[PDB]
């Protein structure tokens, strides 16, 4: 396998992902790509901008991960990287628990203390953030983000690019569409149509 | 100890429990009893129905009742107990259980779940995914604490009650038996038997 | 390094703390101090009252931790202990994940399943309780208490002695003043001024 990992995005998310990869203990060097930050971030060198991806980095030397919180931009850069033949390893924190029967698409990231249970399917570039849990038989579509401490009950579906906020939760058998935003603390007790922004207990359109 | 485990209930919960048991790495074979499905589920073989409870020797198989429903898990559990089966407490490797916690047979403590000092759990309790039960809590028989629910210190939950996903409780609160707390329920005062509550704070529906 | 630890406070909180230190497996003896409880708790001997701290105990023999939930009294006893020359080890439960870039002040306690992400700063005597998570670049001022299952998003500030209740949460870039009490389930989606007490979804003054 590649001995080097390039983490795209040196923001706060980038710092956690870089530390995630560092915790795995398998890489020989971990670096940042960032269009603005220069020098080194939290010990990790920034070697250049997102342009090194197209112009200088070899898919036979570098694994790539996209540490950008914005779902649409993460999709943008992830699809880009994949089209240039880079590997986008599913990154799972040593202190996460991921079921052996779970299927998780490339570029996804599973954070410290997060859990993905049996039969769950995660498409590409999903984020299951700090201590978030995706229970049994859930479907998380491309570039979904489950924020810290959110809990999905069994058979929860979340649509493409949707964003489930810190401390949110869902009842079992609930369905959330694409481009949805559930706020921090949202208690999702019924299906949520595409594009909507909901919050409160129970979760209702803001 | 027994080398084989039979998990009763091959639903979604039963899949998680079977994976929990496999994560333990201490059984030679883990199998499903299911009244419906046939063949294998998630790589685990279904070998018959709850009727094999008959064919099955308590000297060969441990038993666990992976049924979500508190009433039904109660029925099957007592059944297997009466038939003289060992119903081991199944604690996920990635769960943290206090050494001073007391946990009844048949109970299942899922991944990332925490049970703190001096907590008492009766028979057949489910503490689900990342649910936490803090110091000196009392969970009576066949309580189900759902994913990511958090009980503060000195919380009591009555027999067969069901606390929903991501619910929480203030310390020194008490929940009656047969209660249903919905997801996200913020329990800041006592709950009487049979009541179904919800919301922030938890009020009857 | 000291081979004995004294746990001040023998209530529920102290039981959890002494078990935490026991789980570390590095002390040869762990004892309680309490002004009321006598004998032995959970196998841990209560060897005296807090008076032993100023009277009998040697800083060359005993580390000190202040397992008092109440922020103001924890502050009081900790400062007392530090003034007397005692070491106040940061106690991190083996099943907690604490970032290597995080900074945590003496007398702080990080419980099982708790997580503190990158660049987070914690001042003296913080408690991050069971399964509570403090994400990236959060600032927790001295003697803050994050109750079980509370999830703080990135760049959350918590002022001195404030108390975030069980299962509470914050959206990112949220600031909370000193002496605040956010109760169980409080969904903090805006700043919160000093001394205030809030709860609800969203958190409002009661
Ligand atoms: C590592 C990490 O931290 S990942 C970070 C992920 N963090 C999150 O989950 C962010 C979640 N975002 C939120 O909750 C946001 O408040 C949003 C997106 C739902 C709302 O965005 P905005 O509309 O800009 O928030 P704004 O401050 O305008 O709030 C508008 C109103 O909705 C209410 N509201 C806002 N957020 C919430 C919420 N999560 N729950 C309930 N009510 C809310 C506010 O109280 C306000 O009500 P008012 O009319 O009484 O004043
Ligand atoms: C791994 C696993 O899957 S574990 C699975 C365990 N999952 C759970 O925790 C399930 C929890 N179940 C719930 O929370 C359910 O919503 C229940 C049991 C509380 C309600 O069940 P039902 O009676 O079918 O709910 P129903 O859809 O009729 O809701 C009726 C009203 O109550 C409200 N409501 C329902 N559940 C909740 C809740 N958890 N919090 C707040 N309000 C709620 C609804 O918004 C609705 O309000 P309206 O009258 O304004 O439309
Ligand atoms: C190891 C451990 O377990 S650490 C334990 C940590 N535990 C906690 O986090 C406790 C957090 N504290 C709370 O949430 C408390 O409820 C407090 C401090 C907010 C309440 O303070 P008190 O002054 O005692 O409130 P009290 O319960 O008397 O007030 C009841 C009223 O306030 C409301 N209320 C109180 N607490 C809450 C809450 N957490 N969320 C929503 N509403 C609340 C109730 O709706 C009720 O209103 P109503 O009867 O007029 O409809
Ligand atoms: Na949680």
Q: If we measure between CA atoms, which residue out of C125, C200, C130, C132 comes closest to residue C162? A: C125
Structure tokens at B8: 């009763």
Q: Reading across the β-sheet that carries C91-92, which strands appear in turn? A: C91-92, C109-110, C127-128, C145-146, C163-164, C181-182, C197-199, C204-205
Q: Please tell me the number of Cα atoms within 13 Å of B127 on its side-chain side.
A: 35
Tell me: do C72 and C8 sit in the same domain. yes
Structure tokens at A173: 């058998």
- Whether B165 has its CB under 8 Å from any CB of chain A: the answer is yes
For residues A189-206, b (16+ Cβ closer than 10 Å) or e, as one string? beebeeebebbbbbbeee
Structure tokens at C63: 């580390």
In DSSP notation, B97-123 reads E-TT-EE-TT-EE-TT-EE-TT-EE-T
- Whether B155 has its CB under 8 Å from any CB of chain C: the answer is no
A162 CA → ligand 2 middle, Å = 22
* Euclidean distance between CA atoms C109 and C21, whole angstroms: 10
* Euclidean distance between CA atoms C22 and A20, whole angstroms: 28
DSSP label at residue A129: -
- Whether B4 has its CB under 8 Å from any CB of chain C: the answer is no
Contacts with C157 (C-beta within 8 Å, 6 or more apart), sequence order: C138, C139, C140, C141, C174, C175, C176
Contacts with B57 (C-beta within 8 Å, 6 or more apart), sequence order: none
Four-point Cα dihedral A92, A12, A22, A121, nearest 10: 10
Distances in whole angstroms, Cα of residue C104 to Cα of each of A74, C3, C108, C143? 32, 22, 7, 11
Are B148 and A151 spatial neighbours (Cβ–Cβ below 8 Å)?
A: yes
Q: Is the dihedral of CA C45, C48, C54, C57 positive or negative?
A: negative
Q: If we measure between CA atoms, which residue out of C32, C91, C87 comes closest to residue C64? A: C87
Taking contacts as CB-CB distances below 8 angstroms, the residues of chain A near B164 are 171
Q: Please tell me the number of Cα atoms within 13 Å of B145 on its side-chain side.
A: 37
Contacts with B192 (C-beta within 8 Å, 6 or more apart), sequence order: B176, B179
Neighbours of C28 (CB within 10 A): 8
Four-point Cα dihedral B79, B81, B86, B87, nearest 10: 70
Q: If we measure between CA atoms, which residue out of A138, B196, C129, B71 comes closest to residue B187? A: B196
Q: Is C13 helix (H, G, I), strand (E, B) or coil?
A: helix
Q: Indicate the length of chain C as a whole number.
A: 206
Q: If we measure between CA atoms, which residue out of B72, B79, B76, B107 comes closest to residue B92? A: B107
Structure tokens at B141: 């028989």
* Euclidean distance between CA atoms B155 and B151, whole angstroms: 6
Structure tokens at C136: 């990236």
* Euclidean distance between CA atoms C104 and C151, whole angstroms: 18
Structure tokens at B174: 């008490």
Neighbours of A105 (CB within 10 A): 18
Is residue A204 annotated as involved in ligand binding?
yes
Asked, for residue A155, whether it belongs to a domain, the answer is: yes
* Burial of residue A70 (number of CB atoms within 10 Å: 0-12, 13-18, 19+): middle
Domain end residue (candidates: B61, B88, B115): B88
Binding-site entries of B for acetyl-CoA: 144, 153, 162, 165, 170, 183, 203
Q: If we measure between CA atoms, which residue out of A22, A129, A13 comes closest to residue A5? A: A22
Tell me: do B50 and B76 sit in the same domain. yes
Taking contacts as CB-CB distances below 8 angstroms, the residues of chain B near C19 are 98-100, 116-117
Q: Please tell me the number of Cα atoms within 13 Å of C45 on its side-chain side.
A: 6
Cα angle, residue B15 at apex, residues B13 and B20 outer, rounded to 5°:
95
Tell me: do C94 and C46 sit in the same domain. no
* Euclidean distance between CA atoms C118 and C120, whole angstroms: 5
Are A122 and A116 spatial neighbours (Cβ–Cβ below 8 Å)?
A: yes
Tell me: do A65 and A152 sit in the same domain. no
Q: If we measure between CA atoms, which residue out of B112, B22, C134 comes closest to residue A116? A: B112
Taking contacts as CB-CB distances below 8 angstroms, the residues of chain C near B187 are 184
Contacts with A159 (C-beta within 8 Å, 6 or more apart), sequence order: A141, A144, A176, A177, A178, A179, A180, A194
Is there a cis peptide before residue B110, judged by omega within 30 degrees of 0? no
* Euclidean distance between CA atoms B129 and B147, whole angstroms: 4
Domain containing A101 equals 90-199
Domain end residue (candidates: B41, B64, B88): B88
* Euclidean distance between CA atoms A30 and A38, whole angstroms: 15
Which of A199, A201, A204 has the most ligand 1 atoms within 8 A of CB, as the residue to mutate? Answer: A199
Tell me: do A67 and A100 sit in the same domain. no
C153 and A131 within 8 Å at the Cβ level: the answer is no
Q: Is the dihedral of CA C30, C113, B94, B184 positive or negative?
A: positive
Which of A137, A139, A171 has the most ligand 2 atoms within 8 A of CB, as the residue to mutate? Answer: A171
Name residue C121's beta-bridge partners: C103, C139
Name chain A's partners: 3 or more CB pairs within 8 A.
Answer: B, C
B11 to chain C, closest Cα gap in Å: 28
Is residue C199 annotated as involved in ligand binding?
no
A167 and B164 within 8 Å at the Cβ level: the answer is no
Tell me: do B95 and B170 sit in the same domain. yes
Phi, psi of A80 (to 5 degrees): -50, -60
Q: If we measure between CA atoms, which residue out of A7, A69, A72 comes closest to residue A41? A: A7
Task: Find residues 78-137 of chain C whose CB sits inside 8 Å of chain A.
Answer: 97, 99-101, 113, 115, 117-119, 131, 133, 135-137
* Euclidean distance between CA atoms C103 and C89, whole angstroms: 13
DSSP label at residue C165: P
* Euclidean distance between CA atoms C90 and C109, whole angstroms: 6
Q: Indicate the length of chain B as a whole number.
A: 205
Phi, psi of C179 (to 5 degrees): 60, 25
Q: What is the bridge-based pairing of β-strands A157-158 and B144-145? A: unpaired
Minimum-distance CB partner of B16 among A117, A149, A202: A117
A169 CA → ligand 4 middle, Å = 10
* Euclidean distance between CA atoms A169 and C55, whole angstroms: 51
A149 and B148 within 8 Å at the Cβ level: the answer is yes
Q: Indicate the length of chain A as a whole number.
A: 206
Name residue C104's beta-bridge partners: C122
- Whether C57 has its CB under 8 Å from any CB of chain B: the answer is no
Are A102 and A118 spatial neighbours (Cβ–Cβ below 8 Å)?
A: yes
CATH number of the domain to which A185 belongs: 2.160.10.10
Tell me: do C108 and C170 sit in the same domain. yes
Tell me: do C143 and C71 sit in the same domain. no
Experiment type = X-ray
Distances in whole angstroms, Cα of residue C176 to Cα of each of C129, C143, C191, C193, C201? 18, 14, 6, 7, 16
Asked, for residue A206, whether it belongs to a domain, the answer is: no
Question: Tokens 């994400």 appear where?
Answer: C135
Distances in whole angstroms, Cα of residue C44 to Cα of each of A15, A172, C7, C23, C33? 40, 43, 10, 13, 10
Asked, for residue A147, whether it belongs to a domain, the answer is: yes
What total number of domains does chain C contain? Answer: 2
Phi, psi of B23 (to 5 degrees): -60, -30
Structure tokens at C19: 């078990």
* Euclidean distance between CA atoms A25 and A19, whole angstroms: 10
Are B136 and B118 spatial neighbours (Cβ–Cβ below 8 Å)?
A: yes
Q: What is the bridge-based pairing of β-strands A91-92 and A44-48? A: unpaired
For residues B31-63, b (16+ Cβ closer than 10 Å) or e, as one string? bbbbeeeeeebbebebbbbbeebeebeeeebbb
Contacts with C73 (C-beta within 8 Å, 6 or more apart), sequence order: none
Q: Is the CB of B182 under 6 A from ligand 2?
A: yes
* Euclidean distance between CA atoms C16 and C69, whole angstroms: 11
Asked, for residue A204, whether it belongs to a domain, the answer is: no
Is residue C154 annotated as involved in ligand binding?
yes
Rg, Å, chain C Cα set: 17
DSSP label at residue C51: H
Q: What is the bridge-based pairing of β-strands B120-121 and C115-116? A: unpaired
* Euclidean distance between CA atoms C140 and B22, whole angstroms: 40
* Euclidean distance between CA atoms A87 and A1, whole angstroms: 10
CATH number of the domain to which A37 belongs: 3.40.50.20
DSSP label at residue C34: -
A17 CA → ligand 4 middle, Å = 20
* Euclidean distance between CA atoms A141 and A122, whole angstroms: 6
Are B4 and B59 spatial neighbours (Cβ–Cβ below 8 Å)?
A: no
Are A181 and A195 spatial neighbours (Cβ–Cβ below 8 Å)?
A: no
Question: Tokens 């958090």 appear where?
Answer: B150
* Euclidean distance between CA atoms B124 and B130, whole angstroms: 18
For residues C127-161, b (16+ Cβ closer than 10 Å) or e, as one string? bbbbbbbbbbbbbbbbbbbbbbbbbbbbbbbbbbb
In DSSP notation, chain B reads --SEEEEE--SHHHHHHHHHHHHHT--SEEEEE-SS--EEETTEEEEE-GGG-----TTTEEEEE--S-HHHHHHHHHHHHHTT-----EE-TTSEE-TT-EE-TT-EE-TT-EE-TT-EE-TT-EE-TT-EE-TT-EE-TT-EE-TT-EE-TT-EE-TT-EEPTT-EE-TT-EE-TT-EE-TT-EE-S-B-TT-EEETTTTEE-
* Euclidean distance between CA atoms C25 and C20, whole angstroms: 9
* Euclidean distance between CA atoms B133 and C192, whole angstroms: 29
Q: What is the bridge-based pairing of β-strands C40-41 and C29-33? A: unpaired
Q: What is the bridge-based pairing of β-strands B203-204 and B196-198? A: antiparallel
Contacts with C104 (C-beta within 8 Å, 6 or more apart), sequence order: C90, C92, C98, C110, C116, C121, C122, C126
Tell me: do C70 and C132 sit in the same domain. no
Give the rounded distance of the alpha carbon of B167 from its chain centre: 16
Are A155 and A170 spatial neighbours (Cβ–Cβ below 8 Å)?
A: no
Domain end residue (candidates: B88, B122, B144): B88
Are B118 and C42 spatial neighbours (Cβ–Cβ below 8 Å)?
A: yes
Tell me: do B13 and B106 sit in the same domain. no
Q: If we measure between CA atoms, which residue out of C77, C78, C72, C120 comes closest to residue C96? A: C120
Asked, for residue B204, whether it belongs to a domain, the answer is: no
Q: Is C156 helix (H, G, I), strand (E, B) or coil?
A: coil
Across chain A, which distance is largest between two alpha carbons, in Å?
Answer: 50
Closest ligand 3 atom, residue C166 Cα? 9
Task: Find residues 22-41 of chain C whose CB sits inside 8 Å of chain B.
Answer: none
Tell me: do A81 and A95 sit in the same domain. no
Taking contacts as CB-CB distances below 8 angstroms, the residues of chain C near B188 are 183-185, 199
Smallest-distance ligand from the CA of B132 = 4
Four-point Cα dihedral C71, C141, C132, A151, nearest 10: 130
Q: Is A18 helix (H, G, I), strand (E, B) or coil?
A: helix
Are A97 and A112 spatial neighbours (Cβ–Cβ below 8 Å)?
A: no
Tell me: do A62 and A47 sit in the same domain. yes
* Euclidean distance between CA atoms B141 and B123, whole angstroms: 5
């Amino acid at each position: 396998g590649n001995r080097k990992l390039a983490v795209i995005g040196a923001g706060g998310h980038g710092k956690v992902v870089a530390e995630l990869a560092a915790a795995l203990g398998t890489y020989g060097e971990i670096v940042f790509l960032d269009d603005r930050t220069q020098g080194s971030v939290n010990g990790f060198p920034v070697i250049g901008t997102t342009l090194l991806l197209e112009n200088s980095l070899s898919p036979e030397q570098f694994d790539i991960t996209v540490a950008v919180g914005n779902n649409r931009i993460r999709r943008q850069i992830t699809e880009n990287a994949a089209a240039l033949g880079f590997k986008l390893p599913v990154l799972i924190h040593p202190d996460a628990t991921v079921s052996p029967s779970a299927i998780i698409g490339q570029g996804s990231v599973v954070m410290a203390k997060a859990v993905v249970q049996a039969g769950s399917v995660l498409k590409d570039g999903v984020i299951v953030n700090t201590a978030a849990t995706v229970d049994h038989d859930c479907l998380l579509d491309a570039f979904v983000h489950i924020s810290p401490g959110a809990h999905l009950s069994g058979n929860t579906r979340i649509g493409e690019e949707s964003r489930i906020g810190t401390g949110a939760c869902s009842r079992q058998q609930t369905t959330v569409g694409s481009g949805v935003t559930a706020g921090a603390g949202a208690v999702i007790v019924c299906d949520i149509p595409d594009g909507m922004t909901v919050a409160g207990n129970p979760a209702k359109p803001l």
